From a paper:
On each side of the [name], one [name] dimer is wedged between the top and bottom cylinders, as previously reported. Within one [name] dimer, the two OCPs connect via their C-terminal domain (CTD), while their N-terminal domains (NTDs) and their embedded CAN molecules bind to AcpA and ApcB of the PBS [name]. Within the NTD of the [name], the local resolution of CAN and its surrounding residues has increased to 1.7 to 2 Å, and, therefore, the density for all four methyl moieties branching off the polyene chain and for the two terminal beta-ionone rings can be clearly assigned. Regions of [name]-CTD that were previously poorly resolved, especially around the CTD dimerization interface, now show clear continuity and side-chain density, confirming the proposed interface. Within the isolated T-cylinder disk bound to [name], structural flexibility appears mostly restricted to the motion of the dimerized CTDs of [name] with respect to the remainder of the complex. The most prominent motion of the dimerized CTDs of [name] appears to be an up and down rocking relative to the [name]. The flexible linker connecting the NTD and CTD of [name] moves in concert with the CTD dimer. Residues D174-V176 within the linker are in close proximity to the CAN molecule that is embedded in the NTD of OCPR. Proximal to the PBS, R155 in [name] has the largest effect on the TDM, followed by some positively charged residues on ApcA (K61 and K62) and ApcB (K53). Thus, it appears that the positive and negative residues on either end of the CAN give rise to an increase in the S0-S1 TDM by generating a strong electrostatic potential difference that breaks the symmetry along the conjugated chain of the carotenoid.
Residue numbers in the entry:
A (entry chain J), H (entry chain F), J (entry chain N), L (entry chain L): 2 to 161
B (entry chain A): 687 to 896
C (entry chain O), G (entry chain K), I (entry chain M), K (entry chain G): 1 to 161
D (entry chain P): 209 to 249
E (entry chain S): 198 to 207
F (entry chain C): 1 to 67
M (entry chain R): 201 to 204
Write the structure that this text describes.
């Protein structure tokens, strides 16, 4: 979380948390219910978010579901949609925690090795995260959508 | 008669394979000889530069970085070394002061264990004595991790041993007492093999003041 | 180290499931106490040297611990005990902010008894100094915050015996 | 039953989307003039 | 062209 | 951060080395400001000649904003 | 470590013996096998990534190991796992070239069983993945070379359990 | 080449070249006429090697030549076959030089980063090289194909 | 490390006492022995190489340890063995001068058993060699100084056994 | 001690004690009785050395014994004289040992940390030791005072 | 660095061209000189210590350079000077084998003039010594090989100048 | 052994052996039979190589076998031949290995310390090996002698 | 400040 990110940063300098670090922990706990609402929205709409994102992805990247493509065939497409649900579940971890630590340690650390071994094109995984971001940002207010987008974009930036 | 010089070189009694295997591997490990020292004597050979860099990662972090990074944070540091703007020593310190190193070998362990993993990675050995443990414990307690790394790599011992152009490597010190077995215990463990202190502190022989 | 939020997130990820109602209530509970913890950490950091100084003054000074033959005797060993108490307050503050003692397990207690046993540091005297850290800290952060800080200063004491 | 993360849980979703694979393309390295067709921005 | 499956190999 | 760019010629005193040593004998390197005093002392003790020192990064006289 | 030649030399030296007929035979046997060892080694390196990929696909995909709660779950653990398989293939190829498993005892197996029990790495699944690597490599190098790699990959498997 | 590689290893130990190392060089410089024969074969038949390998790749990976694929269209397909000519060319450099250093220094260092920034599925690039290897083998005797096989395999291993 | 003088000082310090008449008696006893210790130390240092040479000849050579397969066999191990014997003699000379064995517990014996047991160094053979060093140096420095050096070489041997 | 100091200097160089070192040790043991007499002198007059020096200190630094001063009040004043007694005893340890390490290891390593934690003005401690050096010097001949002064000056130079 | 072989390859790489007939005719020439190059490089390796000894004797010994005040005076400097001459002969052999002076530019002349200028190593005497090595080398490998070795020792000399 | 060295080098760089390394190992194993024959020659004539070398050695260094000499007497003389036998045996190890590593690891690291401790004139040990090299050369063809002499010369250089 |  934002709390562990700050603590680890201060511990490496043998120091107490700075005023600024305490400030953003205070703000994070104050705006907690808004984060839990955004997290509540994504969880409830996950099935439509992934499907509509899955549908949008394959129309931009028809190759990946064509012969020779990594997601070719229904069974591989099902695996690909599963991966989208993974990364959707991780975005909701990021929002509630106020930090991208749950995302990094579960889904991004070493990810390039995993998808390289499987042959999955990584830039297409990033695209599927864009699609989920769009379907998601239309299910909530702009302020709530904006907060959720920041965590979608973090994944898109790291995968790209 | 059998020539006397032949008898003077003979092995008493027959030796079975166990005795042969034990006697063949006695003494200091052959790893002291069977190794490579990465000494970057030029920057024209980019393949050698990259080989030195990847050896540096393996020495400091104990293995290749790919399975525990998202993207590489050392690219600019490699660029500087490859461009001869820094030396191997500066590259090595750059690794020790990195966020990745903090995550791997500072956050999971107490400062006491940070000390011995520090000297292992950057000096090639377990801590010498209690004075050294004291010296680095004060640095960690007051300035944090980056100060500790800077102290080790910029010290006279480091420069005399590894110099400016050589990646640190495992050492087999003879002196002082207990440095060899302590260094051996450090280097005969795999990464994350356990969460135990090899050298928590040197038991004093004479307590000053007690 | 894991904080209270991480434990909830890890308890669900290990099952591979989104955050349900029960998990949201655990996050809500932690979110409620965020001001309590942040305020206490602010005052502690402001008075860290004072808390240790007065904890020592009340617990270790003018005893056989500091007199010749006691483990605090000699200026070197006096400083070492002060440095150790600075550790225990700073790390107990980390644990209080995180609502979780994992950082104490990892960064403090792992091998601490081995270290102290090799150097001859008295455990019981160390526990008294930490308990005095607790009482001094409580009188400064109020009673509620001092209760939460007491949990993590007690955790160190428990891990030392 | 199916546990979390099992790709079976998305087979129904995969069939519903029914993505359209590109038609087997009509390409032949024999017919391609490499030096003439490579862009020259 | 192969079609990869999502079932564990036996 | 402020950084020095330093040139130094460090000779060999107690050994006749046989490998190539030019790279660790006459070199130019970037040193973080917070390491120069210590590093300069070390080179001096090893018999090294500091032939050039420059403030490669940062500005002289800065009070706030050292990074 | 020792290769086939230095094993013979060192065992002769321990006994203070010149290389007798039996030793010369062992040296001749390794020299004759040398050509097939370098060929298999060159094949494996060209296919190292594909070998591990196939072995994982056929032993450690779409099981509870890769799902939440399985030891391969999370990308960092998946990467660490296939990194481990890469270790075994490369070191098994070293041993194949050397005609001697000692490099495995020294640079692979030392502390490995302890390390896996500490981290909870399932050894049963690991040995299955190694066995799969054995099947995949044999298909690429041949039958004779496949058996040679089989010896050393089996050596790793038996050292894990 | 073979000479530079030997000199570099010897220089890394601050010694003159071993009599064995001077044997490999001596054999190389007298067996070189055969090496030039392999290069002439590959050079003379480079067009058929690339196009036959290019067509074989598209059979196995039709997706990369499909809409959404990196080589979709004639301009991209030509560029793909152009890259194949590069790597075939670099192999002739390796065969003649008796060492892979010419290959690695021109076309394998940072190849992952280049093809990542372009979006090319490097695995398919590895497949194309082993297709050129199969087609090249047919044009050469067993011993010649084995001599050139190491430089083909080396490229394949560094794309995989 | 502690010598005869600091042994007096430390015993007074732990009680927080100035040095009294009895303590001054102990310091005087050591001062009176100073000339004997200094003269012996200079003779030993000027004969160190020859002391070890004769100790090795009568205790180690022409035995299993020097024949092939033996721990002293190979030039490196023979050279290491002489170096170790040089160390023991040199630190015994420190201890004899200091009039206190604490240096041996700190700078010689700390971890020595573990080192030798891991390397396969024969503990009995090194003890026999040190005893040979004790005999040889006694015949060089006399019975009184020989018996004083005998205490600190015997201290090492008892540490190793 | 002089013996320990030379041994650690010799061990640091993995060598036997040099003739220069052995001669220094020989002189020290042969001048032993003269040093012990100086230590006997300091020990016997420790009451008056500390009292007079302490009386002078508070005249020289009245603030430390005023409201808000570290030594204000009879009880704090007693601890200040105790501390002076500590340092006098250490000076006598240094005198009989012919070395400052017994002083350093007991009462100078970490002294700045200890006194800053207590709030004691350390430079006033340097003054208190300075005062003891005059009182002690006036109780012995000049040559004896010079031998003791070296150790007084070492304590003064370290805290100050 | 580049040898004669990779010089031909580089001239083709930068044009993206397969090696043509003319490029092959360059490689044939280098392959034709391979035997003489390897032969000479073996002679020098066997006589390396002797060559510098003889070059030193006719160039440096018994002049002011070796006498007190000369830059060869003292054992450290004499040995350093021979170590440098060892460098020059050995690296010129590399450049002779490769038929390309690039290694001299990268590993000999790179920073050498600045290092010599700061330490007071006289260049003119170093050039005189190298010239003697060339003449001694020529008398030992022949005329044409010595011509090629001379080319690469003259490269260092002009490089130092 | 080049095989061990290559694996050491390859593992230090965490890589498979390069094609150049595998080619060197291939040439190494092919030349094994010639190496083994030379070893058999030296091994067969072991006793006459040592005996004749020892007689030659004593002819030109009579002091070492005359009274007062290191090798004076029958027993000490046999020990001197025993040492020569050791080094001839190590030379065979190196011949078969194709490398000096068995020679250095077994009988040259610290040899100077050993013989200085024993009071053996090291320059005479180097002479004895020179004597064994001359004898052994006259038991094998010129090419075989030249190959075997590199190992004798390695010992001689390390004793000087 | 009292030490009693
Ligand atoms: C790209 C638009 C152009 C181009 C680039 C190019 N650059 C280099 C080499 C280097 N570039 C840098 C720059 C930096 N390193 C850093 O750490 C940072 C600060 C964050 C910067 C800006 C450096 C230091 C080097 C040299 C070291 C290295 O390789 O990293 C090259 C390679 C040159 C070579 O042959 O080594 C190239 C190709 N080249 C073009 O043609 C483009 C116009
Ligand atoms: C004070 C309440 C008590 C006390 C303390 C004391 N400690 C030491 C020495 C050390 N203390 C530590 C502790 C830690 N290192 C870590 O990494 C952690 C986690 C944050 C802890 C708590 C260590 C490692 C040492 C050794 C190194 C050093 O001294 O800096 C001493 C000195 C012992 C000696 O004789 O050397 C002392 C005095 N002593 C008491 O009597 C109090 C009850
Ligand atoms: C001999 C002909 C003349 C001579 C030589 C001399 N050189 C030095 C010191 C050094 N020489 C070098 C040169 C190199 N080092 C390398 O790695 C290479 C590249 C392969 C070269 C050419 C260096 C770097 C030094 C300094 C560091 C070192 O010695 O390791 C000295 C000693 C200088 C001193 O005062 O210490 C000398 C004497 N001197 C003469 O007078 C001859 C004409
Ligand atoms: C969909 C947008 C893209 C795609 C996906 C795809 N993935 C796989 C296979 C796997 N994906 C994972 C991923 C994860 N495991 C984790 O623990 C995490 C975080 C929690 C992630 C993201 C794994 C482990 C697998 C292996 C299969 C298994 O679950 O055991 C495939 C199938 C690969 C195959 O050939 O079997 C696919 C298709 N593919 C695309 O083309 C899209 C761009
Ligand atoms: C894959 C088939 C299985 C698996 C693997 C897995 N391993 C780890 C972690 C480590 N593995 C090792 C092993 C080695 N390190 C070495 O240097 C060598 C010798 C050459 C070996 C054999 C080590 C030391 C670690 C820890 C340190 C590191 O990762 O670098 C993990 C991660 C465990 C964790 O908690 O992070 C995993 C997942 N796991 C499975 O489920 C497969 C059966
Ligand atoms: C003969 C050419 C010279 C000579 C020889 C000589 N040696 C000894 C005694 C020993 N020699 C050794 C040698 C070795 N041990 C090893 O491990 C190795 C490598 C395998 C070697 C070469 C040893 C260990 C001894 C000690 C005795 C023992 O073996 O136990 C002697 C006897 C010396 C004495 O006083 O006992 C002699 C005569 N002497 C000469 O003068 C020749 C120049
Ligand atoms: C000689 C009587 C016996 C013998 C000796 C022998 N020792 C080693 C190796 C080591 N010896 C030490 C010892 C010390 N290190 C210290 O700091 C001190 C404290 C003063 C001591 C006593 C160590 C640490 C080693 C290992 C590291 C090293 O050797 O440098 C060997 C083996 C050497 C090897 O390289 O294998 C030997 C042969 N052996 C006997 O058989 C005698 C009984
Ligand atoms: C007098 C010149 C100055 C002064 C003294 C002062 N000291 C204290 C308290 C302590 N002083 C010590 C000192 C030592 N402990 C050791 O082991 C050593 C041996 C070398 C020393 C010097 C200690 C440990 C204490 C703590 C109390 C205790 O003994 O347990 C005080 C009291 C401070 C308070 O608030 O309690 C004072 C007044 N103060 C001055 O202003 C003078 C300059
Ligand atoms: C006499 C006991 C032995 C002996 C001597 C000998 N020396 C030389 C030649 C030289 N000696 C030196 C020595 C030094 N130069 C220094 O700067 C220092 C430090 C002060 C020393 C010790 C040098 C440099 C030379 C080279 C000649 C020159 O000065 O220019 C010779 C001549 C060798 C030859 O063939 O020219 C000799 C004879 N020779 C023995 O056999 C005795 C054991």
């Amino acid at each position: 979380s934002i709390v562990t990110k700050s603590i680890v940063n201060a511990d490496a300098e043998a120091r107490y948390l700075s005023p600024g670090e305490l400030d953003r922990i205070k703000a994070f706990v104050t705006g907690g219910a808004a984060r839990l609402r955004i997290a509540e929205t994504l969880t409830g709409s996950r099935e439509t978010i992934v499907k509509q994102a899955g549908d949008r992805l394959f129309q931009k990247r028809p190759d990946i579901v064509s012969p020779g493509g990594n997601a070719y065939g229904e069974e591989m497409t099902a695996t690909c949609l599963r991966d989208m649900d993974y990364y959707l579940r991780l975005v909701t971890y990021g929002v509630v925690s106020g930090d991208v630590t749950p995302i990094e340690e579960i889904g991004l650390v070493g990810v390039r090795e995993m998808y390289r071994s499987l042959g999955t094109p990584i830039e297409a995984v990033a695209q599927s995260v864009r699609e989920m971001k769009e379907v998601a940002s239309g299910l909530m207010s702009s302020d709530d959508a904006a907060e959720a987008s920041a965590y979608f974009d973090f994944v898109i930036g790291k995968m790209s | 008669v059998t020539p006397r010089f032949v008898e003077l070189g003979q092995v008493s009694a027959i030796r079975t394979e166990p005795e042969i295997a034990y006697r063949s591997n006695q003494g200091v490990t052959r790893q002291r000889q069977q190794t490579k020292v990465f000494k970057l004597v030029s920057t024209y050979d980019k393949v050698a530069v990259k080989n030195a860099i990847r050896a540096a990662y393996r020495q400091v972090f104990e293995r290749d970085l790919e399975p525990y990074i998202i993207n590489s944070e050392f690219t600019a540091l490699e660029s500087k070394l490859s461009n001869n703007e820094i030396n191997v020593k500066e590259f090595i310190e750059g690794l020790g002061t990195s966020e990745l190193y903090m995550k791997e070998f500072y956050a999971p362990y107490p400062n006491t264990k940070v000390i011995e993993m520090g000297t292992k990675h950057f000096l090639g050995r377990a801590p010498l004595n209690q004075k050294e443990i004291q010296q680095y414990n004060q640095i960690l307690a007051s300035q944090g991790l980056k100060a500790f790394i800077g102290a080790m790599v910029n010290g006279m011992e480091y420069l005399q041993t590894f110099g400016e152009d050589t990646v640190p490597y495992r050492r087999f010190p003879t002196l002082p007492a207990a440095n060899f077995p302590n260094t051996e215990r450090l280097y005969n463990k795999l990464t994350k093999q356990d969460k135990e202190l090899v050298v928590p502190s040197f038991t004093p022989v004479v307590k000053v003041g007690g | 180290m894991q904080d209270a939020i991480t434990a909830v997130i890890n308890s669900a990820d290990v099952q591979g499931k989104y955050l349900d109602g029960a998990a949201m209530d655990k996050l809500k509970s932690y979110f409620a106490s965020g001001e309590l913890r942040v305020r206490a950490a602010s005052v502690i950091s402001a008075n860290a040297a004072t808390i240790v100084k007065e904890a020592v003054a009340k617990s270790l000074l003018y005893s056989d611990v500091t007199r010749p033959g006691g483990n605090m005797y000699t200026t070197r060993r006096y400083a070492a005990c002060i440095r150790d108490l600075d550790y225990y307050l700073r790390y107990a503050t980390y644990a209080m902010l995180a609502g979780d003692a994992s950082i104490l397990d990892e960064r403090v207690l792992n091998g601490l008894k081995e270290t102290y046993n090799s150097l001859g540091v008295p455990i019981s005297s160390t526990v008294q100094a930490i308990q005095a850290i607790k009482e001094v800290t409580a009188s400064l952060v109020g009673a509620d915050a001092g209760k939460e800080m007491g949990v993590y200063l007690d955790y160190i004491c428990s891990g030392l015996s | 039953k199916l546990t979390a993360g099992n790709p079976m849980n998305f087979l129904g979703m995969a069939r519903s989307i029914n993505p359209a694979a590109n038609t087997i393309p009509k390409v032949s390295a024999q017919n391609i003039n490499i030096e003439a067709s490579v862009p020259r921005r | 062209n192969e079609v990869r499956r999502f079932i564990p190999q036996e | 951060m402020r950084m020095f760019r330093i040139t130094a010629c460090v000779p060999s005193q107690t050994r006749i080395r046989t490998q190539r040593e030019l790279q660790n004998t006459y070199f130019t390197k970037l040193v973080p400001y917070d390491n120069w005093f210590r590093e300069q002392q070390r080179i001096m003790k090893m018999g090294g000649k500091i032939v050039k020192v420059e403030l490669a990064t940062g500005r002289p006289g800065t009070n706030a904003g050292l990074a």
